[PDB]
């Protein structure tokens, strides 16, 4: 169709945690929705079912189940092999739609013990562990790299439980977030006056507004439109940044394609004023 632009991309910065980039010649609605997809629609694996055998910590039961849910899971393995629990032929759970986790600890020593993700192990083969100390000793040491203190225990206290991680997404529960956050900005010089500054001199110029190193502050243009969106997605650690964005784009592509197939199905029978 004659009206589709030529959506270009440029990558500025990439690290273990950040991806900083500019998308150009595209619509604002594409920009906002692709951002909405990065939070809500990107699938991931997270703990979702917890059963507690014995819990003697100084913290109550659901409190533990909650903390376990929120720990991020290294889903470097294509979560597409793991189908949604709703769809799978199995009763309740199975290896093909679940990962299984197990935790058993007790404080036998007189000193206080910490419970962390290293003690929590995947019964499932080592390809889908917790985020702490797996692919790397990592030269940037996080002193203990404990991921999270799940709880604390003393002499005589013990904690034995099971957990079942599953695929789900962000618009269901916050635990299924592939993002720690996402920055998003467009037209940093306010050329379009989509925001209207009283006393424009008291505003601090943004990291991209430097193109006009000029202290003149916002040159106007009345025939402008949105163009050149600036993103900076940062991972929570559960998935490498570029892989989140690529999965988001494709998943959204599956989502529209589904709307087309439903729409075609509607006109498969009666024409319903198709022309």
């Amino acid at each position: 169709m004659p009206y589709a632009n030529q959506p270009t991309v440029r990558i500025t910065e990439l690290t273990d945690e950040n991806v900083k980039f500019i998308i150009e010649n595209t619509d604002l609605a594409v920009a906002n929705s692709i951002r909405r997809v990065f939070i809500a629609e990107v699938p991931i694996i997270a703990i979702d079912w917890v059963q507690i055998d014995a819990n003697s910590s100084v913290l109550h039961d659901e409190f533990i189940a909650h903390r376990l849910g929120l720990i991020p899971l290294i889903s470097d393995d294509i979560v597409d092999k793991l189908q949604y629990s709703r769809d799978c032929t199995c009763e309740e759970f199975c290896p093909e739609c679940s990962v299984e986790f197990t935790l058993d600890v007790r404080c036998n020593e007189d000193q206080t013990r910490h419970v962390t993700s290293r003690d929590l192990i995947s019964n499932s083969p080592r390809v889908i562990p917790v985020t702490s100390r797996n692919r790397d000793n990592d030269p940037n040491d996080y002193v203990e790299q404990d991921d999270i203190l799940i709880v604390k225990l003393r002499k005589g206290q013990e904690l034995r439980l099971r957990a079942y991680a599953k695929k789900g997404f962000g618009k269901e529960h916050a635990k299924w977030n592939p993002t720690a956050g996402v920055a998003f900005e467009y037209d940093p010089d306010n050329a379009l006056r989509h925001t209207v500054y009283p006393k424009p001199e008291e505003w601090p110029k943004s990291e991209y507004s430097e193109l006009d190193e000029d202290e003149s502050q916002a040159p106007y243009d009345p025939n402008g439109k949105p163009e050149r969106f600036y993103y900076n997605v940062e991972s929570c650690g559960s998935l490498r940044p570029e892989t989140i964005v690529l999965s988001a784009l494709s998943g959204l592509k599956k989502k529209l394609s589904d709307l087309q197939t439903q729409l075609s199905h509607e006109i498969q029978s009666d024409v319903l004023t198709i022309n």
Partner: protein, 67 residues
Amino acid sequence: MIIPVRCFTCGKIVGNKWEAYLGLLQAEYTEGDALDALGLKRYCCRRMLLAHVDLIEKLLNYAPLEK
């Protein structure tokens, strides 16, 4: 009681950074800088870790080497 995994506001995991913060303040007095070295660049995360209170320790303190 006990740090919330991930900051309420944004999502950034913030239990991974707790004990390191307490350790660093015990070693080095520059709490603004201590938060920066830890990597919590942004103030929602900074209130999270900054204004948290470790109440768990009074609870561990009780006689309860029994329950």
